[PDB]
Amino acid sequence: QDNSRYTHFLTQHYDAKPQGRDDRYCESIMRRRGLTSPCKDINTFIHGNKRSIKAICENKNGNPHRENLRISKSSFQVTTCKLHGGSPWPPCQYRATAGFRNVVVACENGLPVHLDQSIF
């Protein structure tokens, strides 16, 4: 069961099936996930199956990384939304960068609670 941080993690970084992996996608999703007041500078969404993400917390799909993080063994489709411009207030324009690679997360009680966005 989903503690607040894991739930928060999903709201901010998980979109099972994104309708688009483009700029408009970012503009829409950042808004729906309430990441636009103020505009979040950069935010990556992981797509695909939630269990694979959870699995990064076990050796099943992850390895230790750094001194408190885990990096996935598998690659995920991801979409990074980067704020375009300077205004921290809506409308938040975003440039989307679609990629496919493993991800780094922090796990707590076997659940991903933090996405290291420094690799995007």
Q: How far apart are CA 106 and CA 56, in angstroms?
A: 9
Alpha helices in 14-114 (DSSP H): 23-32, 50-55
Alpha helices in 33-111 (DSSP H): 50-55
Cβ contacts of 119 within 8 Å, gap of 6 or more: 101, 103, 104
What's this structure's resolution in Å?
Answer: 1.8
Residue 31: left (phi > 0), alpha (psi -120 to 50), or beta?
alpha
Residue 57 assigned to a binding site: no
71 DSSP β-pair partners = 63, 104
For 12, 64, 103, the CA distances from 24, given in Å and listed in that order, are: 17, 35, 23
Residue 26 assigned to a binding site: no
| Strands 69-72 and 76-84, bridge-based pairing | unpaired
Q: 101, 90 in Cβ contact below 8 A?
A: no
Residue 103 assigned to a binding site: yes
Residue 21 assigned to a binding site: yes
CATH of residue 22: 3.10.130.10
Q: How far apart are CA 22 and CA 99, in angstroms?
A: 11
Sign of CA pseudo-dihedral 50, 5, 59, 66: positive
Which amino acid is it at 109?
N
96 DSSP β-pair partners = 81
Q: Which residues are catalytic?
A: 13, 114
Q: Which domain holds residue 105?
A: 2-120
Q: Point out residues after which the chain has a gap (C–N over 2.5 Å).
A: none
What total number of domains does the chain contain? 1
Q: How far apart are CA 36 and CA 63, in angstroms?
A: 33
